[PDB]
Amino acid sequence: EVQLLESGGGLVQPGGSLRLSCAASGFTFSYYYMGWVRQAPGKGLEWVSGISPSSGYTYYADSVKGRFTISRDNSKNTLYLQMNSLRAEDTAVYYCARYYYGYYYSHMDYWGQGTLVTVSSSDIQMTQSPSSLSASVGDRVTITCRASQSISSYLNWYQQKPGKAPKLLIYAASSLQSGVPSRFSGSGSGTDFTLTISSLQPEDFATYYCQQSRSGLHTFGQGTKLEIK
Amino acid sequence: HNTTVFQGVAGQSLQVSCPYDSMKHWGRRKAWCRQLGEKGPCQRVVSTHNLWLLSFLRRWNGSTAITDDTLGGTLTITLRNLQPHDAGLYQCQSLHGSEADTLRKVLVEVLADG
């Protein structure tokens, strides 16, 4: 089976340096694109960086460009993320994720459980209209997601239970990921997309994010809290 | 039926060859689709000529060209001017009626000028 084991987190003073390591096993590491996604404590997901199998293409976010350095060693099946000049803005829980075949138009199907980093003492935006939504068991919930520009039909939906790594539900606008139950469904094209759950379940109460996948910066959405009414 | 990796420098033409049995796939058209996930879809990028007798004629579609040799049994795919957004999993398909058989899984890698 696939395992994404992360390490290298802890406390650090402002201006310090850390080196996050993500050991991988179960898949041909030299085939897939890799990427980092951090989540601030009590906030939404933020796409950090990404890398190519041959390490020739390195994509960084604007907030972490110049200070972070993503790298990989296919001979040891490990993904690295050198973090320098650590400001107080970088305090988040970093997640290790692997891309399905490709980078553009692709999706993060496998995630690591995450490591905590605490700093102690073609740009498209994604906006989800329902920030806080409350529904009961068996209701019909429909979360939306608007893009800044045309992103075709390459959008992903992720489910993140409180205290665990996010899991992939819908990819490529409307495709159901293997293992996801048939209750989830997606739709939309261009700039307006919707995530629909037919009948909710006790395990469906979590946070849902939408991620665009047309440019080199696969930015996430602001998030949608879905709990009991 | 595992995957075969085809890597090419970005900016140059990548040639992906898909051999097949010329006797088994006689009278069958060929297609080149892009697989976006484990559950599909394999969106058809380009297919051979509508008439199987003219499979040698190149059929262009964007930056992807396809040509087939029905006698020698060789399907040649050409990704003219490689781009980083062309990387991913693809399929060589042999079309017969309503069904479609997979000839070879292809993983396109893009190298930044190695």
Author numbering:
A (entry chain A): 3 to 123, 138 to 245
B (entry chain G): 19 to 132
The authors write:
TREM2 contains an immunoglobulin-like (Ig-like) domain followed by a flexible stalk region, a transmembrane domain, and a short cytoplasmic tail.
No significant differences were observed in scFv-4 binding to the TREM2 Ig domain in the equivalent structure using the shorter TREM2 construct His19-Asp131. Overall, the variable heavy (VH) and variable light (VL) domains of scFv-4 displayed canonical immunoglobulin folds tethered by an engineered glycine-serine-rich linker that was disordered in the refined structure. Additional side chain- and water-mediated hydrogen bond interactions were provided by scFv-4 loops CDR-H3 and CDR-L2. Our data are therefore consistent with the effect of scFv-3 and scFv-4 upon shedding of sTREM2 being due to promoting the internalization of TREM2.
